[PDB]
Amino acid sequence: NSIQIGGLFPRGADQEYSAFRVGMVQFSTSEFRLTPHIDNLEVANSFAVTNAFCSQFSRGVYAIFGFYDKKSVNTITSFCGTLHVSFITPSFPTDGTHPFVIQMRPDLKGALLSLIEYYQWDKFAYLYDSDRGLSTLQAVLDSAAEKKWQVTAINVGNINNDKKDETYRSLFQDLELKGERRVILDCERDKVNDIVDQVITIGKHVKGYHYIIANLGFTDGDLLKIQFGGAEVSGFQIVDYDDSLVSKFIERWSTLEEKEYPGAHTATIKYTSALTYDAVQVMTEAFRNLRKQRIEISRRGNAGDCLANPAVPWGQGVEIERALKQVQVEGLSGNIKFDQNGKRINYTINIMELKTNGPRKIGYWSEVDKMVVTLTEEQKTVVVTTILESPYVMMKKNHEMLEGNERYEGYCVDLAAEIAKHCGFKYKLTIVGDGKYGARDADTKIWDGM
């Protein structure tokens, strides 16, 4: 019962392959054993993806687990669609109806829009890059037009890293111009961190700003940087460490040796790697359900050349696809089930907010229920401005010998003393700079005076 399954790991992805191996070990059974063929490539390169795909194909794999990019995703969808080979990916969900693709990642759109509706944001700024596609952008634009939102869409992906210093300062300058505070970051974690550092550098992480990080990795990245900055930050978490399954898995994960499994010694795990683990679970359970239904998908002969024209798909593939799509299991991503098209259904996205003490879950998001909320949660010297007028405020004869509120005498001084006495605060008497009561300048439109 050796089941050949191809896999594609982008060079530099370690914890993903680590969790993949751990998944292989944990979900291994005496009945059948998956025999992975791992192939490292450049995920953004379409040529490389095509080559690797046809390589796995000619090897006669029954399924393929991998990743794609905005560039390469069409190659995968088209080829898997033509050759009837099942493809499982942690990478961003495709927008459309794509057959023979199983997308592990849940749709973030609903969670984000429901979050905006929750915080009652009328106007905000949306920072995006073209990596995972513009699907979310389209979504928030159409929903902005429907809900009457004024949204500032800015592409941060096209700014070159070599020349990007003043570009971001100018960006947040233009963003400060309109007084717009609320900001949403939809970006890859690297770009996220970069933008964050630029924010702390320009001091935009102070009070009055609200950042929304859109991804499933909210606690996977370092939140300690802006944690004490005093700006509110919100995000999404696909892995709940409070769950017993996730907790025990984490114990075993943290006990693992780093040498054998790279980057596997940690308190937490990146959501992509977790999705990989859950994907392993899905594959195992799928083929198990294939064996329980007494259907033999075994290949009679080699697949031949993938580019051979006209391409002919194998029959078994459809059965394997349905087998995968019918799977419902419990995993690190929560309840795992798919629709006919292969998208995630009935998932749970934990809605979290970063506080002083640290991050905490403020609620959850369901595909049906939308947003649902979980458990609900000295004296400064008062500056007194005044102007010199008789007998309201006057300078004492000996005033040069005195200091502070003792310098001034008058009706308003005594009245101030009384107001402070009843309201119970310390007060500092000061004379206004421009020496006017109050006015609006017809030119500058600026209020002058007290």
Binding site: D122, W149, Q150, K178, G179, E180, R181, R440
Partner: protein
């Protein structure tokens, strides 16, 4: 040039709204300020009344924090009343 009460109204609502947009979340506090700025920019037949008085009143009593857009959209059609006294 020539004065137009209608043009004054349409300008007034827009300038008030655009002003309140910078003040998002404190919006209910700044209605009168933005109304002043709008009355200045769009002009008024009586300096006391302002460009559109009824819209200002409607906004003042209706506008709640972050509820701005719907509030303005409800109040911008409102009758300005008599721009004399």
């Amino acid at each position: 040039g020539p004065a137009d009460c209608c043009r004054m109204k349409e300008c007034c609502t827009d300038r008030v709204n655009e002003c309140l947009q910078r003040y998002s979340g404190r919006e209910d506090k700044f209605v009168s300020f933005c109304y002043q700025e709008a009355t200045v920019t769009c002009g008024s037949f009586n300096e006391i009344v302002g460009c559109c008085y009824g819209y200002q009143m409607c906004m003042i009593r209706v506008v709640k924090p972050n509820s701005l857009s719907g509030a303005h959209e409800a109040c911008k059609t409102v009758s300005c009343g008599n721009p004399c006294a």
